[PDB]
């Protein structure tokens, strides 16, 4: 899910209260359609409601369905709301406390995001962009190595139980470590930035069963998210449950701190894109990784067959037996091609498109050969001796929406097993009736 | 993917905005520059990809000018305020030149174009415009020079947008035409963010969506080559394609073409 | 060596990785080579590469190398030495070389000039400067055989002896046994017992610059050796052949396949050498051209090996030309040299250099090794992505499209299996409406089309349904010239079908459009011939199969010669405007009526 | 016959490569096209016959 569906299921209220940081404003303007961004500086200045036949005449008659869209999405997000103009007319306006504050956030006015930086001077430890970067990936890696159930990688005990209720693991016997199911591995098989902004959601979706505000912790999200890289912020200022959600940030790699107790943090590469190379790919099904960590050589071996391991490159080739492993797994052709085309190198984006159509076709191909056949268990009804008779019956079990194939040349009908009961007794009545 | 480059060229020429403050009006340079920073600021919310540049001409040369508000705005504004003041406190008029060297700030733009084309990623196009708010009147001296300009920008397909203030410029109408750009005449200077808004903040896809005002009366008066002034009726040389004003019994450039 | 993930990783290895990845080249332990293409010194470690090794594989981005004996051997027959070799496999390595690589590549380049074998007087003789190495294979029991009577110690000057002239395939076979490998070089420059002709080709057959990379490399050092040289049908082939013959300035012997290749080299020697037809002979019982004292002359297999009674005038032939030396004798479509009485014919005729020209050097029962050694080295191997990105050769773009198996043929062919479904999927309904389709398509749009198809009984409905030319093959010899001299100079009609034909070097004119069917089982040859009768979009070639059938196997197992090449196939599963227009079996009650007369075969 | 033409075209058109291809064209293109290059990109990749 993207962020304008979680944000378009929340009340009324809590988009009121998230508009009231000028950081949250930025970004849910940024997640907005272009036609929709056009609309939203037009307006800014406007303090008095348009009509809604006047904002429909700025875009022409084709293009009707973007702006209608567009407009939906606008009213579902609560940017704008419908004012009875005098006459019977309807208004469209901003929201002023949205509009207010993405001026703050644009114009200026206020004070800044962050409390303040230079009262505790220079940092004492401070690191440098390569160092946090690197910080940040180690940690990624020990995520994802404990989704795996390594050893070498220890976490918090609630870092597992998040995972659990996520549904990556389940823990069948206590005290022995979770399997991770199909949809862990899926999970796994997704790229990075979308891996992050996944758990995040579920840290939200189950926000609310530690207590924690998700306004502040939204807030305060995307203030990391549009924060500058290798600069620290003050830690002051904050309430303590958000804190403690910072201290999990510490965990996930995502905000740098060496101590607890430390007043400063500095966000990370990984911290700025969580508000949204090194394959190359061959015509003869070969794989040349520019890699030498464990994980991008473990993802790759899931659905291919290694070869060769220099101390710098791998190659592997992608086989009909490997992809069948691999979906047999849980994972997708579609998971596979997307995860290609992220990881692919920059040489293969001269190549329009960057992966060879034939690869693809390939392995979509070899995706359909999984689900050739389709089983229905159903039972089967052959003993009509009349028409009118069998297309009562017919009628019957499709008001119950309990048919799943159905032949009227030769009076041949198949329910569900559990819909085979209430045709039984049907047809028993009906006889009866008779 | 979409990468979209706006390069914005400031008219600071010191006589027409001295005398624009002379007047007392509503409008003043401060405003102006105030404006561009504010439509800067909003191409930049646009996109996260979306790149600025910000050229200020002079009768001296061009100038590259490129608490509660965004940080990378934050310093993306102070610079252009820093710029624009040293340009303007250093600005002393030594010579009988008055005319804007808007033709040197599009070549410069040009290569400044071409040069982040090459650091773009295969994978994206980098679409780019140049917006042009015109204050001065126009110089004709440098019609050949333009000209090479607004060629050169139709071969890269770099899109024109001209923003006259007070007096239209046909080289504008021209390089607008050409270059598929818009051509508007502010009605009212203190409105012109809301016009910048309104017209030139979209980009050309969106402009297919979006209603916009029609094209105003572009003309195609030529410049005489002995006289660097427009006309509409003249010789023109059947071999070099010069143009001249009056008829001659020799052509002065195939005189010189031996 | 371990097998955590099933691959033979070697990172312990090779770990010299200084700074940082300036050398676009990867080494393996046991012997291979990775090149990377998008690297500003390509060009520079493609021309190395290429003079020590020979390719396994060429696609867009990684090159991919095998080192081998022969490559090693090709490599130091030229100037390089060793030490130049081993220093710049070294420069180039970015990992560092492994220490099983330099060990083979000295064990290799040792053993190469030690021996060579030299034909004189008609007499073969083989020399050595060392003397120790005539004991040591002297024990050699095969050798033993070779002499006769015994060639006491042939004391010249340097210790050689003389061999059994029918005898020298086995001696050649035992040598690289031996790891003492033999050489074929003929020093032309300085012979005076040979009546060199006066052949001179005309300073106006300008060569690409990619045949004066296989000529050059051909003349090292001012001599000729023998070698093996690929070049695509539609690329220039016979030129390069016609100019090592004017280069070597000898008498100069042609072996070609079919009865019309000797027409075509003809052809060619009269274009392209400027020699006079009374020197030219072609010796194929045909017209007789008195080839009796000749310059150069021109015949095929088959009739150098009979191994029945041979006309009079024939055998006059073979008796004068076994009776005199030959200069760079030349083979045509060497692909199919190791066979069992084509190899033979390598014996049964004495020349100093063998010189053998293919397109499609793949071949199964894996006797291409047998080659090596037969006639000499893998001497070039043209990149044919490079060929066609320069555009003298046409970029095809190759196609795959298969058609689902219709219920009515479905049934009987999973009912059969005694050798009786080959014309089942052949006749596939769905199979002909595509052919069909693309026959259209291409017709309404003017492209030329050569429909290859094996099976003749199938292509007999085939063909006779939408009343099109065919060759059957054995129809005669004029009606096939006639028939393939109008299908270039016909606008109305510009589509034939081939059985089995056109699996060889002919003169078949410019084609756009190739749709095969129902070819032979695994021939990665005969695809790899056929495609090269297109190329010369320009233009594309499709091959049609049946699902659920064993043609899928066999077009998989086909195409991976293609792929090494760098082509890719394309699957099509659909075909737009199928229904657009009406196609032959259209209804059910044909396709059904179909079943009778493909099962009416019953050869029993 | 009239219905035979329909029903080989029913059973041929559709018979394997279309049954789970259409249902995916059917569950699927509920979004806009990302960029016009990807059509200019099969276009180019597409054979002539797949371009009427
Ligand atoms: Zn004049
Ligand atoms: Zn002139």
Same mark, same amino acid.
């Given at each position: 899910r993207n962020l304008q569906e979680f944000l378009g299921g929340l009340s009324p209220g809590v988009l009121d209260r998230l508009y009231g940081h000028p950081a949250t404003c930025l970004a849910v303007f940024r997640e907005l359609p272009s036609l929709a961004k056009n609309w939203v500086m037009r307006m800014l200045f406007l303090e008095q409601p348009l009509p809604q036949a006047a904002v429909a005449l700025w875009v022409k008659k084709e293009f009707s369905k973007a702006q209608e869209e567009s407009t939906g999405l606008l009213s579902g997000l609560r940017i704008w709301h419908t004012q009875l103009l005098p006459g019977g007319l309807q208004g469209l306006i901003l929201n002023p406390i949205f509009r207010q504050n993405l001026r703050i956030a644009l114009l200026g006015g206020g004070k800044?995001?962050?409390?303040?930086?230079?009262?505790?001077?220079?940092?004492?430890?401070a690191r440098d962009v390569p160092s946090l970067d690197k910080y940040a990936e180690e940690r990624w890696e020990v995520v994802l190595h404990f989704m795996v159930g390594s050893p070498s990688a220890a976490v918090s005990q609630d870092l597992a139980q998040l995972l659990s209720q996520a549904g990556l693991?389940?823990?069948?016997?206590?005290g022995e470590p979770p399997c991770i199911t199909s949809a862990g591995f899926q999970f796994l098989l997704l790229d990075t930035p979308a891996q992050l902004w996944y758990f995040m959601l579920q840290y939200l979706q189950t926000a609310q069963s530690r207590g924690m505000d998700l306004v502040e912790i939204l807030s305060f999200l995307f203030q990391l998210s549009f924060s500058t890289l290798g600069k620290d912020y003050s830690?002051?200022?904050?309430?303590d449950s958000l804190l403690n959600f910072l201290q999990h940030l510490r965990e996930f790699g995502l905000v740098f701190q060496?101590?607890?107790?430390?007043?400063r943090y500095y966000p990370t590469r990984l911290a700025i894109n969580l508000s949204s190379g090194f394959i190359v790919v061959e015509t003869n099904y070969r794989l040349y990784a520019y890699t030498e960590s464990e994980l991008q050589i473990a993802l790759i071996a899931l659905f291919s067959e290694m070869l060769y391991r220099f101390p710098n490159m791998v190659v592997a080739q992608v086989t009909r037996e490997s992809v069948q492993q691999a979906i047999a797994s849980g994972i997708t052709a579609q998971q596979i091609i997307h995860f290609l085309r992220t990881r692919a190198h920059p040489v293969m984006?001269?190549?329009?498109?960057?992966?060879?159509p034939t690869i693809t076709d390939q392995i979509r191909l070899w995706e359909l050969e999984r689900d050739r056949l389709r089983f229905t268990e159903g039972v089967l009804y052959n003993?009509?001796?009349?028409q009118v008779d069998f297309e009562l019956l017919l009628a019957h079990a499709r008001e119950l929406g309990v048919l799943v194939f159905e032949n009227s040349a030769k009076r041949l009908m198949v329910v569900t097993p559990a819909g085979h009961s209430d045709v039984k007794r049907f047809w028993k009545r009906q006889k009866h009736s008779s | 993917d979409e990468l979209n480059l706006l390069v914005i060229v400031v008219d600071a020429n010191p006589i027409w905005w001295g005398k624009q403050a002379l007047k007392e009006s509503q409008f003043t340079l401060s405003k102006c520059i105030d404006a561009v920073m504010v439509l800067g600021n909003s191409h930049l919310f646009m996109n996260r990809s979306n790149k600025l540049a910000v050229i200020a001409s002079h009768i001296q040369e061009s100038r590259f000018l490129y608490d509660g508000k965004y940080e990378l705005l934050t310093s993306a504004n102070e610079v252009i305020v820093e710029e624009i003041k040293d340009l303007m406190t250093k600005s002393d008029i030594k010579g009988q030149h008055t005319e804007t060297l808007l033709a040197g700030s599009l070549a410069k733009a040009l290569c400044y174009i071409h040069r982040m084309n090459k650091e773009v990623k295969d994978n994206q196009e980098m679409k780019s415009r140049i917006l042009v708010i015109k204050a001065a009147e126009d110089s004709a001296l440098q019609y050949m020079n333009f000209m090479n300009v607004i060629f050169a920008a139709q071969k890269q397909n770099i899109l024109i947008d001209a923003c006259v203030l007070d007096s239209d410029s046909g080289l504008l109408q021209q390089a607008c035409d050409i270059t598929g750009g818009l051509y508007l005449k502010v009605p009212?200077?203190?409105s012109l963010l809301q016009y910048l808004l309104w017209?030139?903040?979209?980009?050309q896809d969106q402009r297919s969506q979006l209603i916009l005002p029609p094209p105003v009366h572009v003309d195609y008066r030529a410049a005489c080559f002995c006289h660097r002034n427009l006309i509409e009726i003249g010789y023109v040389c059947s071999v070099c394609l010069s143009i001249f004003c009056n008829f001659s019994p020799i052509c002065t450039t195939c005189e010189t073409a031996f | 060596k371990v097998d955590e993930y099933g691959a033979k990783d070697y990172r312990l290895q090779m /770990? *010299?990785?200084?700074?940082?990845?300036?050398?676009?080249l990867w080494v393996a332990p046991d012997g291979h080579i990775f090149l990377e293409? !998008? $690297?500003?010194?390509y060009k520079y470690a493609q021309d190395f590469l290429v003079a020590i090794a020979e390719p396994v594989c060429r696609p867009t981005h990684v090159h991919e190398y095998k080192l081998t004996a022969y490559s090693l051997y090709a490599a130091v027959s030229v100037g390089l030495q060793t030490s130049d070799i081993t220093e710049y496999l070294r420069k180039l390595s970015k990992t560092g070389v492994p220490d099983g690589i330099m060990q083979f590549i000295k064990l290799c380049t040792? $053993?190469?000039?030690?021996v060579k074998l030299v034909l004189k007087h008609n007499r073969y003789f083989v020399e050595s400067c060392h003397p120790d190495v005539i004991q040591h294979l002297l024990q050699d029991p095969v050798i033993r &055989?070779?002499? *006769?009577? =015994? $060639? &006491?110690?042939?004391? +010249?000057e340097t210790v050689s002896f003389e061999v059994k002239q029918e005898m020298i395939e086995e001696l050649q076979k035992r040598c690289i046994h031996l790891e003492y490998p033999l050489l074929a070089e003929y020093? !032309?420059? =300085?012979?005076?017992?040979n009546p060199d002709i006066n052949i001179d080709l005309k300073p106006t057959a300008v060569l690409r610059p990619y045949q004066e990379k296989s000529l050059r490399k051909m003349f090292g050092n001012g001599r000729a050796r023998s070698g093996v040289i690929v070049l695509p049908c539609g690329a220039g082939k016979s030129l390069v052949g016609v100019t090592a013959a004017c280069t070597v300035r000898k008498r100069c012997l042609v072996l070609g396949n079919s009865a019309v290749s000797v027409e075509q080299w003809k052809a060619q020697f009269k274009m392209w050498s400027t020699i006079d037809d009374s020197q030219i002979c072609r010796?194929?019982?045909?017209?007789?051209?008195? /080839?009796?004292?000749?310059?150069v002359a021109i015949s095929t297999y088959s009739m150098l090996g009979h191994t029945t009674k041979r006309s009079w005038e024939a055998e006059r032939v073979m008796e004068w030309l076994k009776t005199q030396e030959w200069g760079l004798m030349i083979l045509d &479509?060497?692909? +199919?040299?190791?066979?069992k009485m084509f190899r033979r014919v390598l014996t049964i005729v004495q020349a100093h250099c063998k010189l053998g020209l293919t397109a499609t050097l793949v071949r199964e029962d894996?006797?291409?090794?047998?080659l090596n050694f037969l006639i000499?080295?893998? *001497?070039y191997e043209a990149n044919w992505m490079e060929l066609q990105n320069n555009g003298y050769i046409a970029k095809v773009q190759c196609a795959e499209v298969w058609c689902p198996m219709s219920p009515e043929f479905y049934r009987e062919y999973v009912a059969i299996? +005694?050798?009786?479904r080959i014309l089942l999927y052949t006749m596939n309904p769905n199979k002909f409406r595509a052919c069909q389709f693309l026959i259209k398509f291409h017709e309404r749009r003017n492209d030329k089309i050569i429909v290859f198809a094996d099976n003749v009984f199938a292509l007999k409905e085939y063909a006779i349904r939408l009343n099109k030319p065919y060759i059957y093959?054995?129809?005669s010899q004029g009606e096939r010239m006639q028939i393939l001299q109008n299908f270039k100079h016909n606008p109305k009609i510009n589509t034939i079908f081939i059985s089995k034909?056109?699996? +060889?070097?002919?003169? *078949?004119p410019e084609a756009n459009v190739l749709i095969q069917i129902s070819?032979?089982?695994?021939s990665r040859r005969q695809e790899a011939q056929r495609l090269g009768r297109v190329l010369r979009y320009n233009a594309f070639f499709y091959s049609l199969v049946s699902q659920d059938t064993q043609e899928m196997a066999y077009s998989t197992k086909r195409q991976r010669f293609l792929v090494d090449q760098g082509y890719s196939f394309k699957v099509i599963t659909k075909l737009a405007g199928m229904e657009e227009e009406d196609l032959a079996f259209s209804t059910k009650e044909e396709q059904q009526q179909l079943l009778q007369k493909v099962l009416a075969a019953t050869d029993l | 016959g009239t219905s035979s033409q329909a029903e080989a075209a029913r059973i041929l058109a559709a018979?394997?490569?279309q049954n789970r291809e259409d249902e995916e064209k059917q569950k699927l293109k509920?979004?806009?096209?990302?960029?016009?290059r990807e059509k200019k990109a099969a276009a180019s990749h597409l054979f002539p016959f797949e371009k009427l």
């Open positions: 800044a995001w962050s409390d303040d930086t230079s009262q505790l001077g220079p940092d004492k430890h693991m389940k823990s069948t016997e206590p830690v002051e200022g904050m309430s060496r101590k607890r107790k430390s007043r984006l001269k190549q329009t498109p960057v992966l060879p003993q009509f001796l009349s | 009212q200077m203190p017209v030139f903040l979209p980009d | /770990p *010299l990785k200084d700074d940082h990845t300036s050398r676009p293409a !998008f $690297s500003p010194v040792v $053993s190469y000039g030690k &055989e070779c002499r *006769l009577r =015994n $060639s &006491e110690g042939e004391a +010249t020093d !032309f420059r =300085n012979d005076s017992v010796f194929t019982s045909d017209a007789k051209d008195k /080839p009796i004292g000749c310059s &479509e060497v692909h +199919t040299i190791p066979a894996d006797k291409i090794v047998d000499g080295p893998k *001497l299996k +005694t050798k009786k093959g054995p129809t034909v056109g699996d +060889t070097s002919f003169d *078949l070819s032979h089982g695994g | 018979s394997w490569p509920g979004g806009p096209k990302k960029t016009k």
